[PDB]
Amino acid sequence: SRRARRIPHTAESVAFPLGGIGTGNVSLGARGELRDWEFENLPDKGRLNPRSFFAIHAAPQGGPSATRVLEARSSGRHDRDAGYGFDELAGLPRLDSAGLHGEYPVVDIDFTDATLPVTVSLHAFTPLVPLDADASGIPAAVLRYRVVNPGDAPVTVTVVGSMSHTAGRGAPGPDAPWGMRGTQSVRWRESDGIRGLDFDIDLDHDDPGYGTMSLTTTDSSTTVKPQWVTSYWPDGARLFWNDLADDGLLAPEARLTLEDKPRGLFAERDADPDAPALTEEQMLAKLPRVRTGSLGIVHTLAPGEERDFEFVLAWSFPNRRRGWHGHIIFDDALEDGAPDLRDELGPIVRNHYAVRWPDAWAAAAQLHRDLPALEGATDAFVEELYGGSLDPVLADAVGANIAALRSTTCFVLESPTPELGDGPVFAAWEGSFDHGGSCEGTCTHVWSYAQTAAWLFPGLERSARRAEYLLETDESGAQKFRGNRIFGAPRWFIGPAVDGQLGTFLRLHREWRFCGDDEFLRELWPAAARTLDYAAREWDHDGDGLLDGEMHNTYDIEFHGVEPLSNIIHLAALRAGVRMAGHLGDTARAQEWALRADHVAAAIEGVLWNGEYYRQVIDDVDAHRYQYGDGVLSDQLLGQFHAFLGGLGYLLPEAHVRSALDAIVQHNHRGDLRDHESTQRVYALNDEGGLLLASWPEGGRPALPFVYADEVWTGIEHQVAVSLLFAGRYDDALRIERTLRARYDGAHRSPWNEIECGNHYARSLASWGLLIGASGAQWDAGARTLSFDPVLPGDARFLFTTATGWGGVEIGDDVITLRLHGGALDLDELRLRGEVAGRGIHLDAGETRTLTLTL
Amino acid sequence: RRARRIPHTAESVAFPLGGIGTGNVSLGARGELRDWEFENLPDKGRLNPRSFFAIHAAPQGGPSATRVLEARSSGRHDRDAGYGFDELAGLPRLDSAGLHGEYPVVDIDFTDATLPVTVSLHAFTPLVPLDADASGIPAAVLRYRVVNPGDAPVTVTVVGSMSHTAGRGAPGPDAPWGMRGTQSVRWRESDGIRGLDFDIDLDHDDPGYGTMSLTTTDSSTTVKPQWVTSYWPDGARLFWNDLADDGLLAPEARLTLEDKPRGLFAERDADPDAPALTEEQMLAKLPRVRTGSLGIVHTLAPGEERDFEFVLAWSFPNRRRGWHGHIIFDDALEDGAPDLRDELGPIVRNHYAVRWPDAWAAAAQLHRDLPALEGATDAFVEELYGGSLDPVLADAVGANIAALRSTTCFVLESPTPELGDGPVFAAWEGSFDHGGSCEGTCTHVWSYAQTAAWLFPGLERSARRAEYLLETDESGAQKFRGNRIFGAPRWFIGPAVDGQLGTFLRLHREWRFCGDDEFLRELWPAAARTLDYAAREWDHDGDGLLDGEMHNTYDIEFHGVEPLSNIIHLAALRAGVRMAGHLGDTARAQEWALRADHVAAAIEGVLWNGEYYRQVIDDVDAHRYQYGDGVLSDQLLGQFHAFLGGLGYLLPEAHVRSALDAIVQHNHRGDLRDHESTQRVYALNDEGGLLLASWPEGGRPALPFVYADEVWTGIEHQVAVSLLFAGRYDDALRIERTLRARYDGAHRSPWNEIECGNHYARSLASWGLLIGASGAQWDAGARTLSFDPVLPGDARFLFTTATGWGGVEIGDDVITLRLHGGALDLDELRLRGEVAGRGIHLDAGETRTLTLT
Ligand SMILES: OC[C@H]1O[C@@H](O)[C@@H](O)[C@@H]1O
Ligand SMILES: OC[C@H]1O[C@@H](O)[C@@H](O)[C@@H]1O
Ligand SMILES: OC[C@H]1O[C@@H](O)[C@@H](O)[C@@H]1O
Ligand SMILES: OC[C@H]1O[C@@H](O)[C@@H](O)[C@@H]1O
Ligand SMILES: OC[C@H]1O[C@@H](O)[C@@H](O)[C@@H]1O
Ligand SMILES: [Cl-]
Ligand SMILES: [Cl-]
Ligand SMILES: [Cl-]
Ligand SMILES: [Mg+2]
Ligand SMILES: [Mg+2]
Ligand SMILES: [Mg+2]
Ligand SMILES: [Mg+2]
Ligand SMILES: [Mg+2]
Ligand SMILES: [Mg+2]
Ligand SMILES: [Mg+2]
Ligand SMILES: [Mg+2]
Numbered sequence A: 001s002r003r004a005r006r007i008p009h010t011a012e013s014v015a016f017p018l019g020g021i022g023t024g025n026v027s028l029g030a031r032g033e034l035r036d037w038e039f040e041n042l043p044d045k046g047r048l049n050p051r052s053f054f055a056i057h058a059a060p061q062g063g064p065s066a067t068r069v070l071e072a073r074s075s076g077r078h079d080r081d082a083g084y085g086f087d088e089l090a091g092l093p094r095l096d097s098a099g100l101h102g103e104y105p106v107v108d109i110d111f112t113d114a115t116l117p118v119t120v121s122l123h124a125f126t127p128l129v130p131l132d133a134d135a136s137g138i139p140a141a142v143l144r145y146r147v148v149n150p151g152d153a154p155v156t157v158t159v160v161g162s163m164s165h166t167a168g169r170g171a172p173g174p175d176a177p178w179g180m181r182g183t184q185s186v187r188w189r190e191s192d193g194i195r196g197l198d199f200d201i202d203l204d205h206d207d208p209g210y211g212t213m214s215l216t217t218t219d220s221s222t223t224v225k226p227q228w229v230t231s232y233w234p235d236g237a238r239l240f241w242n243d244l245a246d247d248g249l250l251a252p253e254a255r256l257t258l259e260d261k262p263r264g265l266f267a268e269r270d271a272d273p274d275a276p277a278l279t280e281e282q283m284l285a286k287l288p289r290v291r292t293g294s295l296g297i298v299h300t301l302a303p304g305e306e307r308d309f310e311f312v313l314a315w316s317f318p319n320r321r322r323g324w325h326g327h328i329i330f331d332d333a334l335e336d337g338a339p340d341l342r343d344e345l346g347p348i349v350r351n352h353y354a355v356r357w358p359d360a361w362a363a364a365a366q367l368h369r370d371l372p373a374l375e376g377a378t379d380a381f382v383e384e385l386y387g388g389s390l391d392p393v394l395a396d397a398v399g400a401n402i403a404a405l406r407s408t409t410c411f412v413l414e415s416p417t418p419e420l421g422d423g424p425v426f427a428a429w430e431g432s433f434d435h436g437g438s439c440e441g442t443c444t445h446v447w448s449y450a451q452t453a454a455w456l457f458p459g460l461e462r463s464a465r466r467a468e469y470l471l472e473t474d475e476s477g478a479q480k481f482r483g484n485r486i487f488g489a490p491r492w493f494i495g496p497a498v499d500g501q502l503g504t505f506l507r508l509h510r511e512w513r514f515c516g517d518d519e520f521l522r523e524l525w526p527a528a529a530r531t532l533d534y535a536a537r538e539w540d541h542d543g544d545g546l547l548d549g550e551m552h553n554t555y556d557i558e559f560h561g562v563e564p565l566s567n568i569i570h571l572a573a574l575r576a577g578v579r580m581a582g583h584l585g586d587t588a589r590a591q592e593w594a595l596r597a598d599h600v601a602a603a604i605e606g607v608l609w610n611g612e613y614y615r616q617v618i619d620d621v622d623a624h625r626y627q628y629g630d631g632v633l634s635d636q637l638l639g640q641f642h643a644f645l646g647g648l649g650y651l652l653p654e655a656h657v658r659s660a661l662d663a664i665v666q667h668n669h670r671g672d673l674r675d676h677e678s679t680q681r682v683y684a685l686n687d688e689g690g691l692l693l694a695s696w697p698e699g700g701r702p703a704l705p706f707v708y709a710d711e712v713w714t715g716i717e718h719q720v721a722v723s724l725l726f727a728g729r730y731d732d733a734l735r736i737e738r739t740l741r742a743r744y745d746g747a748h749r750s751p752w753n754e755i756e757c758g759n760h761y762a763r764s765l766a767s768w769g770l771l772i773g774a775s776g777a778q779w780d781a782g783a784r785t786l787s788f789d790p791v792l793p794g795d796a797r798f799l800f801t802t803a804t805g806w807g808g809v810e811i812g813d814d815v816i817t818l819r820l821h822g823g824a825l826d827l828d829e830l831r832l833r834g835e836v837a838g839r840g841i842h843l844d845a846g847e848t849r850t851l852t853l854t855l
Numbered sequence B: 001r002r003a004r005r006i007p008h009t010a011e012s013v014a015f016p017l018g019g020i021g022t023g024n025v026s027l028g029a030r031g032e033l034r035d036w037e038f039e040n041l042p043d044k045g046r047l048n049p050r051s052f053f054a055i056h057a058a059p060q061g062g063p064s065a066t067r068v069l070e071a072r073s074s075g076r077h078d079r080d081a082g083y084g085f086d087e088l089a090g091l092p093r094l095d096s097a098g099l100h101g102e103y104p105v106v107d108i109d110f111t112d113a114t115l116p117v118t119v120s121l122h123a124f125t126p127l128v129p130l131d132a133d134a135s136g137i138p139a140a141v142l143r144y145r146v147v148n149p150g151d152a153p154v155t156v157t158v159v160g161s162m163s164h165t166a167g168r169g170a171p172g173p174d175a176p177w178g179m180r181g182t183q184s185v186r187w188r189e190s191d192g193i194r195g196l197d198f199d200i201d202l203d204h205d206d207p208g209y210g211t212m213s214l215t216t217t218d219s220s221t222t223v224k225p226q227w228v229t230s231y232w233p234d235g236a237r238l239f240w241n242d243l244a245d246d247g248l249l250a251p252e253a254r255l256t257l258e259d260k261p262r263g264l265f266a267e268r269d270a271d272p273d274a275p276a277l278t279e280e281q282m283l284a285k286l287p288r289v290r291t292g293s294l295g296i297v298h299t300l301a302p303g304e305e306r307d308f309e310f311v312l313a314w315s316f317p318n319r320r321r322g323w324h325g326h327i328i329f330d331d332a333l334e335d336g337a338p339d340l341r342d343e344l345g346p347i348v349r350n351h352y353a354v355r356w357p358d359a360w361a362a363a364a365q366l367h368r369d370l371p372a373l374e375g376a377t378d379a380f381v382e383e384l385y386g387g388s389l390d391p392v393l394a395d396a397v398g399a400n401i402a403a404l405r406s407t408t409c410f411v412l413e414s415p416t417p418e419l420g421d422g423p424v425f426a427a428w429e430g431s432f433d434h435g436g437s438c439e440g441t442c443t444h445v446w447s448y449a450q451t452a453a454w455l456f457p458g459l460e461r462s463a464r465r466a467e468y469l470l471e472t473d474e475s476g477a478q479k480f481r482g483n484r485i486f487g488a489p490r491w492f493i494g495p496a497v498d499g500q501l502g503t504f505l506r507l508h509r510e511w512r513f514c515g516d517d518e519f520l521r522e523l524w525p526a527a528a529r530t531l532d533y534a535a536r537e538w539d540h541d542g543d544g545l546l547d548g549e550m551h552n553t554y555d556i557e558f559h560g561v562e563p564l565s566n567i568i569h570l571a572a573l574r575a576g577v578r579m580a581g582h583l584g585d586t587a588r589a590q591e592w593a594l595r596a597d598h599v600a601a602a603i604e605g606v607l608w609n610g611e612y613y614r615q616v617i618d619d620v621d622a623h624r625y626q627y628g629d630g631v632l633s634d635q636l637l638g639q640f641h642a643f644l645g646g647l648g649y650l651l652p653e654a655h656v657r658s659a660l661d662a663i664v665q666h667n668h669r670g671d672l673r674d675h676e677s678t679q680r681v682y683a684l685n686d687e688g689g690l691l692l693a694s695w696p697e698g699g700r701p702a703l704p705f706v707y708a709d710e711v712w713t714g715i716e717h718q719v720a721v722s723l724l725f726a727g728r729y730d731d732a733l734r735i736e737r738t739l740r741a742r743y744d745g746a747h748r749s750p751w752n753e754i755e756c757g758n759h760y761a762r763s764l765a766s767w768g769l770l771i772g773a774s775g776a777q778w779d780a781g782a783r784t785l786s787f788d789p790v791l792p793g794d795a796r797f798l799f800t801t802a803t804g805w806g807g808v809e810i811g812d813d814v815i816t817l818r819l820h821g822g823a824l825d826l827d828e829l830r831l832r833g834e835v836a837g838r839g840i841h842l843d844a845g846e847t848r849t850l851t852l853t
């Protein structure tokens, strides 16, 4: 019995990512293969790790043995240009089928095979502990193979992991013989309560490419080949399979190379033949530089017996080259006016995880030592996220997209700049191209959509807000939307985006509301208030209160005229600003902004509202390229998404907000795209559906609309779905999410990778809002109040988080129950549907309280 | 349709257009162009921006339809940044398609539920047997046939949009926007054709320089010669607006919609109040690829079919001098041959550039000569695919021609003065996706390749000249990878036994095909030395059998005494006696004939085990990479050559058949799911194939040779050919059915058999299937042509000879020759060992039917 939908081994795009926040990753495919080896501070989809696989030797008592790689057979194209290569070991026998059942962060892959005399499943995960970014940021994974004997005789089983270290690649050069800038090492090690293989490399400690790996177990019943033979030809693999398939046991290799000297095709041109053998060490110095080892675990299973064969795979690449080194913020794109600290600071910035764990073994030792608590938290998380009342579609959308936050798109730097003081700083690309970062600078117009980190790892988001307000905001309140100064470099010379700058203000409110830390807010307040004032002063040119004229946005273009994206975000920002200003005692600003907001709201209703939705008012929709006029913009109510999430309620008349959301769905949602015409980028096509960025149901399409109008972005789908949940439009929210997640169901794209400008795209983290909207969760740390208001009536059960603690809430039978899995919770009031359920509620981790509602 | 329908869902399938040495572009089973590789390197997976065909169909008094002329995509859609702008993946397409390939011709039939017309694409690059230049045009026909099945007229526009491919450079100040030069496109009408002519402002001798064109002879055109270039993709949007509006196009009044760099594209250091930029100045700051559209417009009556015919041509005439590969490095060279490179200069030209120095020249030729070129191509297809061969065998023979016309092979114009003026054939072993695989016209690989020797023999002769005149030393040591064609010093690695002696067998093959004794005499001093080298240097125990360490195609050395080396040597000696005796080299004729009889006796006394031939060695594990009493699939490779060379059986017939039977019985696998290989994979899962070796009687080494557990199509082919000659038809057919099933489109492409690279040269062993099936024996010296089909009864085959090619049709009482090209002047025609005619002459276009009594 599996709760998650079975994804077949034929679904080639599927990749379940292991790893945690900022650690880099390796993934499991639906065949149970390891893939996408990307530990080294850059994405690397498709990177093959030579000779890195799990295998089984099953020896039935009195029967023929079977030796297989623990993967389902490949399918689809087999036309590799040089065949599947030696180091892929594609020619070893594999299993009939598999089914992958992912409830991120946990996966189960159940193998089926008619020849193997045992049945195998893989359970794998990297712990996720809500509100604990370090515990959720271990550079390691559990790979636990459960083996069952369904037969009638005992079977002696060996499960063996064979692994190469990934470190050391280099571009052709005198420093990179054999494509490797250093020689790897591997050794058997037993220390720190664990045992297994410890990999290293003789690169300098400060080399960006320096790193370690380990494959370990706490199981005493091991058989090992610590280092495979390194020859010119792949003798090592052949000898490994001979050794395993013979007896299910392994031995260390007596000779680490079978070469005596360079010979034949490998001979040195200027070499004397009849020259005698070199020593083993001299010969190894001339040979390939990757090392491989095998760790086996051996147990005999009686008929009906089940046993776990448990491994940890760990890694460490502590060093990043200082700087984004992206594709936007080049030296010819820096402004002066902020001094360049980069010389004065080292050329390396460390990954935060490398402070706690100096190398791979340290991370493995911790994961193994603390496994019961780390796994127990992870399991409690999974049960609350996937085992509650949410439609499975919504739980899928919320949980699967956490992978983006734990992907190469995001990372955590240790003390990159003295301007922020000491400690970790979260930063991120927008996305991950297959082999490089996409769109540097913790881009504010994109990241404003992302909600997941604000509810699961709020300290990360706070650390980023500090960078924006302390480093990227000038004295006028102009804020950059890509941040370069985290690295001690000058700012990017491009100026503000309206969505970026005002969405960052909204996020400051969100962060402050979650944590209740007025000192956090006070530090950033002079800068933040300037960025809100900047809008009314600089972006309203006709004095009506509506932002108007040329403003840059997340569509990489400027809107002209007067339109809702900018204005409804501004309205939301003003309302948030009143809450913050008022609480801090900035009473003058609070009253000014409240009155401004009232005017903005009336002007939006008077000008942008058309009786059905909000739209762009412009003299001539074709005067400027890249406009939309009377089209329906899916993001017209983005401000209202933030407002709902921020506890600010409706910004505009409820019937008009619901009308506009209904118009977005009715006009912009496509169930099928056969008849769609787009010259734009494709994230949805053919017999898929999706929410278009814009459409023109009443005409008025420009010759050249904004450049993404005909596209489908999951982040925009999510935000609209969220708003629909808050507005009571459940069926339409579910329609949007079912349609979107169908595009990511494994058939054509992976559930764990929603894409836009890059894999693991930050905008996809809008999805967390589905949980908040479905549950009506409103946590106000300043007031110490928690309320719920589920979209659907009757019984409900959801995950929730707050700054102090996390757990489950269960509603129904005229009661409300809180169960706290981590931290603490101290509530002045708990409300349900606007009514007080209880006062003065104090819980610690492991406790539950059930309150009966008033009749 | 005669060819099997491959569905549009078969993503690996790619039908390659282009010819010998031209570079290529392919059509996938969706009808899409893919694998743009014109520029003297492979480039599988290269996307050409904004390069596609579209249709506008405007029913009289009905709503119009505008579609890209491609079937819907399928499979994985998880591109990291989505399908990009320039792929135009979001435009409406046709529901489905079926691809019917009889290489060199393809038909792609589209199906759509709503389009008001039906469409098919017929495409080809001509192939004219025995005419390598006519088969080497850097152009293709793309002929869209549109049918109006309705009862009202429909006005149809078929429009080709294209971008030139030239100009890429590594990111840097030298390649703004990824481009080292700026492209140009214009409307042109000259040389009897019209359409779009593309160029680039790179220097005339730049390796990256080239041209492209999209042309028609149809007078009914509508054109947008140059799309708008903006920072954003305004060009494509304006194109589709223009096509979908009315099915007609216009030139763009403005070639960019930018006035100056602004916003995200602003120059930080730009004077914010600078003088206005001209259009030409603004273009200079913008992407450097250019795109144009050529439309053909016709109103189709109810029931009417009309062809919308285009030619796509290209020309990248300049190659860097050298292989620039991954084996023959400038510090892997030996001294002793003069380095001519500084004198000759850094470029060598493609031979096709002599006739066709730009794209328009090639197009103009293809259009002008299309009736003759297409007629020859069509006759070729009818003979190869429309005769009596089992369709599996016709598929294996014909589809693999693609390797010869791929990036694996090329033809240099006068690369070295040491060979005199004219074309020189040279080749990789294969094509990696983005680079050549294994340079040097590798002789141990190319010895398996038969297709060029029967279809384009002059190419093979030019390569033999390089090997004997440039790569053979005074001792008779021949290199197996050639550098001297470029004027470069020789590779330092020494000879391979299969390569050196296989080349000698190919010299005999070439000479027998062409009958030119001057060709043979020029090469004879060197060639004779290479055969004598073997008995002198490779037989250490003086028993006549080659023994000890010898390098081979498996990239290792066999030790002991074994049949691959020895049976090839036997074959080469028999060929040597034929050549020596004809030349009047009576000394060598007698010496080699004695040596050959001794070798045959010794093979039978030592290597034969009563069932097959095997390696005799003290300890199969003493040296890595041996095989001992295993069954080596290539053990009778020499006999494959002998059969094709008219030398018959080398060893007792029953022994040769027993060995072949052992190879089939022991090495052929119907299913590979339980196979245990740590080697490379060209066959797996529920596929079958012929393993390189197996150990049915035990004696498997711990570390056998490094490819023993693999499956190579070239070795499947050679064994299947030998089985045909030995009368083991059913087993040959099973081998071929099993291997071609691996390339049926479900997992791999029919037109790309793989080994160390795509389009692998060893796969050209497949031609021998036609030879074996038909029993064709052409001896130009004797002017005799004979056939001896494996199967009884009526038969109909393609054949080739030096002078002419066509079809042979065999019946009970008669044999018919139909000649499609050239001429045939036979001393004697034989069928099944009997004389069928004497003094028979035919010219192209003639048919003669001769009585067998
Ligand atoms: O296409 C890349 C190719 O380059 C060589 O290293 C091949 O092994 C590989 O497949
Ligand atoms: O896909 C669009 C996104 O990609 C980047 O250019 C961003 O600026 C933009 O929001
Ligand atoms: O579905 C019919 C088409 O009409 C336009 O709105 C397109 O988006 C849509 O796909
Ligand atoms: O595949 C890697 C990615 O790098 C960037 O150029 C993207 O366009 C591309 O898709
Ligand atoms: O696939 C094997 C082939 O690849 C190259 O190394 C050739 O030498 C060899 O014959
Ligand atoms: Cl946190
Ligand atoms: Cl404009
Ligand atoms: Cl020729
Ligand atoms: Mg890649
Ligand atoms: Mg170490
Ligand atoms: Mg063993
Ligand atoms: Mg202004
Ligand atoms: Mg205004
Ligand atoms: Mg549907
Ligand atoms: Mg589908
Ligand atoms: Mg509600």
Ligand SMILES: [Mg+2]
Pocket (backbone or CB within 6 Å): B044, B045, B433, B434
């Ligand atoms: Mg590629």
Ligand SMILES: [Mg+2]
Pocket (backbone or CB within 6 Å): B197, B198, B199, B211, B358
């Ligand atoms: Mg020109």
Ligand SMILES: [Mg+2]
Pocket (backbone or CB within 6 Å): B241, B242, B243, B244, B245, B246, B247, B248, B249, B250
């Ligand atoms: Mg038009």
Ligand SMILES: [Mg+2]
Pocket (backbone or CB within 6 Å): B538, B539, B540, B541, B542, B543, B544, B545, B546, B547
């Ligand atoms: Mg001997």
Ligand SMILES: [Mg+2]
Pocket (backbone or CB within 6 Å): B746, B747
């Ligand atoms: Mg299949």
Ligand SMILES: [Mg+2]
Pocket (backbone or CB within 6 Å): B843
């Ligand atoms: Mg005549």
Ligand SMILES: [Mg+2]
Pocket (backbone or CB within 6 Å): B823, B824, B841, B842, B843
């Ligand atoms: Mg004549």
